[PDB]
């Protein structure tokens, strides 16, 4: 109660605790992933011998990421709002296109999402922050003053001090995000002084989202605090925490989640160890295990590496040269076995893609788990879409949409639609375009001609509903509105293309 | 009888008994499950040697989850109510869609069921709790006051102290569920004080469903007790225990159930130990068992691993080096055999899926027992569906449905029908859409053309029942009502599309 | 923009937009200078040669 300063050192204690725990555990884990991912020696490679590390999770990322790009960077149909049937054309797809068109190609595009993937699959934690900014350059026609925008940036979750007792975004009582915010930002804020840490003061700042009882009252909302260096803070009640804290696998009841590397490492290190061991044994056989004595062969055969090739014992030629056993080629079948295991861990198709033409593309490449991970990423980003929708429905701007047409009012007073639907893009019904479109076209075309033989075109499903029937084809073909208009609903075109042109001629 | 404090001590004793027994046995079993799933070393791996642990249960879970998604996360046809033949359209499908649309798209999706799967198949027990809450933010148009919601949460059954002598939901005389419910919830209740256990008091609370004699009368119903810390409790005559307690295998007469881990223990352990033994023998062969003596070879050949390669005996080189036997590659064939068994343990098709096109999709993929487990999951969720329908038929809200059309009265006065039918989803009649729809279309198209040749349309099944005939196709296509409306029942549509348009022309 | 040649007459001028690209060839982790296509085929080349 009446907390204005105890919040400062309480937040400092929370920041220090998150520093300690998060740093130790998560930094050690993500740093292990970093060292064995890049393929540099792990430190157990002695000098004078080839410490070659065979990178195997690098191609694993090279495999997983493009499928993520296909499923996610594919049109604006990924997430829908699907509110009550009345208000759909009004704001549902309208606010959907607003938030996508503002997030895609207006909020850092998909690059932040790519780095988000990496953060949740490389260094075990994918989390970003969404915030606001102003606009400048007025007519001093060109009136650009105080326009508000809302955009997202990766937080570098190494600078995302937070308790491990959340397991979800709306569970952390203390969210500390660390940034530089140099003397330029100190001046823009207005603090004339600095901290211990020349414009290159490399000053360090932190932002804390946390709730307490600072008013001697009930449960308070989220509080945003700009605890920088125990200096002038920006304390403010907050409305929604802009973070997402991915874990990439929907692991059990814990905040920080394991990475994709954490399950392919076994394959990677086993591969590298076996290949290095086999070449080392090959080299051991190649050099020649010739036993040299003491007193005789004072040159140790010149280490069996020079261009002389003379043993030069002295007088005794007993010699007991042990023969180094060779290594069979069947251990190189373990290379293929490890490739298959690395597959069957994430990309179960050992090949690039392991009558009925394998409907749904071999049922999504044999119920591929990457589709599940895409499902979980999309459902997590549902919260991001809501967060952006809130930060814009509080106030963003009056800007016009590019939603296939002209006409869109201000999106600072939409209906949030209280939920985002993103089922039809993943392990759900998820009939991918290459499959949904083909199944639709084939079966619908064949029922269509069957009924036209049997029933007809106008009495049954007609050119206005055949409009939508062909439409599914059009939208799946990538061109949604303009290339295949075909609307013909009820118009001067429809009065001359469905009723007059047919009932009289 | 007339028990007010002896109930508290009796419940404390039952809490302690459940703690001891359930904690010890089931917690140890689920901890073993967690340890062997996570693939960390079992503890028998000595330092200096590769303790490789093969996570074999993980890809099995990855195999079973998508099938769970096909069976469950596919349409709302999973459970019907099966009332009298009259009150079907009235509430049966109506209340079915009400509970679904409240549970899907309004109750956290399937994530809680995902965790329920995991708990019952990996952590050895899947149980969840259904409860109620209120709604806020009125006009201060926007009138949101006292609206009641009912929703379910996973309990982490480690916090579900309960006797092992139930074997069913309606058999536990003592259901103790543990939670945190920190000081915020204490103040929300109104308790000014706390227990032994700073707003972070990390307090812990328990909830008890138990029946006893507290009124000096006949057999009383259940009672709910908010036994927290021997502090202010919340007792109430309770009516329905909102729990599910899945076991994932329908084990014999005992409460707690086995995990899938409990049956893949042998497969995973054998695979890991065999590959570890093979690789260890490989390393032993590589290093070389060279017999050295005392006094000579004081450098122990530099452990036969350095880059010098000079044995440096002294003067004697008798040497009796035994040769380590190699390991044949046929054990890698038994690795394929183990993969085949790991199939044949749960997913009896060792492959991804092991003339008449293999009718019913090779008879549900070689009569896969995963479909049986899905059946028993569905019958388990039958009770949960009834619990929800009760908690809403007592009081939920007046809100309408999204059941293909606008219009639904208050679901606080439905008819529960006392029964939830879910037969057609599994091994049962269960003609899956993938085969039901295809057999339907083939047989119907051929019989229908035969009838047209011989009998005709109006004589036999007509356009109004040809409507339903095409319907099975349409509902199998994912668009049930709207895309193929075709109802044409008796209307201006029937008057100009089935009655007058054909007889007079 | 500063034409610091040899600590001599510089062509100092405010600039509007920096004309550079600084690729890294692989979109490597959070660092300016990135690893090349060399760093992943050098191992294969070295093993082949040896």
Automatic annotation (TrEMBL), chain C:
Could you name the domain of life of the organism this protein comes from?
Viruses
Question: What protein name is recorded for this chain?
Answer: ORF.04
Q: Which organism is it from?
A: Pseudomonas phage PaP3
* Name of the coding gene: orf4
Q: Which residues of the full protein are shown?
A: 304 to 353 of 705
């Amino acid at each position: 109660p009446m907390d204005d300063e105890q919040v400062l050192r309480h937040l400092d204690q929370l920041v220090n605790d998150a520093l300690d725990f998060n740093s130790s555990e998560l930094s050690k884990q993500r740093s292990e992933a970093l060292k064995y991912y890049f393929g540099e020696p792990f430190g157990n490679e002695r000098p004078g011998k080839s410490g070659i590390v065979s990178r195997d999770v690098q191609e694993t990322v090279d495999w997983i990421m493009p499928s993520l790009m296909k499923v996610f960077t594919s049109g604006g149909q990924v997430v829908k709002y699907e509110p009550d049937t009345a208000e759909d054309v009004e704001q549902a797809e309208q606010e959907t296109e607003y938030v996508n068109y503002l997030f895609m190609r207006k909020n850092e595009g998909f690059k932040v999402m790519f780095d988000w993937f990496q953060d949740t699959l490389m260094m075990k934690t994918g989390v970003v922050k969404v915030y606001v900014e102003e606009v400048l350059k007025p007519t001093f026609i060109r009136k650009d003053k105080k326009k508000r925008e809302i955009k997202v940036l990766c937080v570098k979750p190494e600078n995302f001090l937070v308790d491990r007792l959340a397991t979800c975004i709306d569970d952390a009582r203390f969210l500390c995000h660390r940034e530089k915010y140099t003397v330029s930002d100190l001046r823009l804020l207005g603090v004339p002084e600095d901290v211990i840490e020349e414009a290159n003061r490399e000053v360090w700042a932190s932002e804390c989202y946390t709730l307490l009882d600072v008013d001697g009252d009930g449960i308070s909302e989220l509080r945003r605090i700009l605890y920088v260096g125990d200096y002038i803070i920006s304390n403010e009640p907050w409305d929604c925490r802009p973070f997402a804290d991915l874990n990439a696998y929907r692991i059990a009841h814990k905040f920080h989640g394991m990475s994709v590397y954490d399950k392919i490492r076994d394959i990677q290190e086993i591969r590298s160890v076996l290949m290095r061991n086999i070449m080392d044994n090959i080299y051991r056989t190649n050099q020649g295990r010739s036993v040299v004595l003491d007193g005789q062969v004072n040159l140790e055969d010149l280490l069996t590496n020079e261009a002389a090739g003379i043993v030069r014992v002295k007088s005794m030629n007993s010699i007991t040269p042990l023969e180094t056993p060779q290594l069979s080629g069947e251990v190189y079948g373990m290379l293929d076995r490890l490739e298959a295991d690395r597959g069957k861990r994430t990309g179960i198709t050992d090949r690039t893609r392991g009558a009925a033409m394998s409907v749904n593309q071999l049922m999504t490449a044999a119920e591929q788990q990457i589709d599940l991970i895409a499902r979980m990423f999309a459902e997590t980003g549902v919260k991001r879409l809501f967060q952006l929708l809130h930060d814009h429905a509080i106030k963003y701007q009056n800007q016009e949409e590019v939603f296939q047409l002209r006409g869109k009012w201000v999106a600072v007073n939409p209906a949030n639609w209280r939920e985002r639907s993103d089922l039809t893009v993943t392990v759900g019904i998820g009939n991918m375009n290459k499959d949904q479109q083909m199944l639709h076209l084939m079966r619908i075309w064949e029922m269509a001609q069957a009924v036209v033989g049997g029933g007809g075109l106008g009495v049954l499903v007609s050119e206005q509903n055949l409009y939508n029937i062909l439409k599914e084809v059009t939208e799946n073909a990538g061109y949604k509105d303009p290339d295949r208009f075909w609307t013909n609903p009820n118009s001067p075109e429809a009065l001359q293309a469905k009723a007059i042109r047919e009932q009289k001629e």
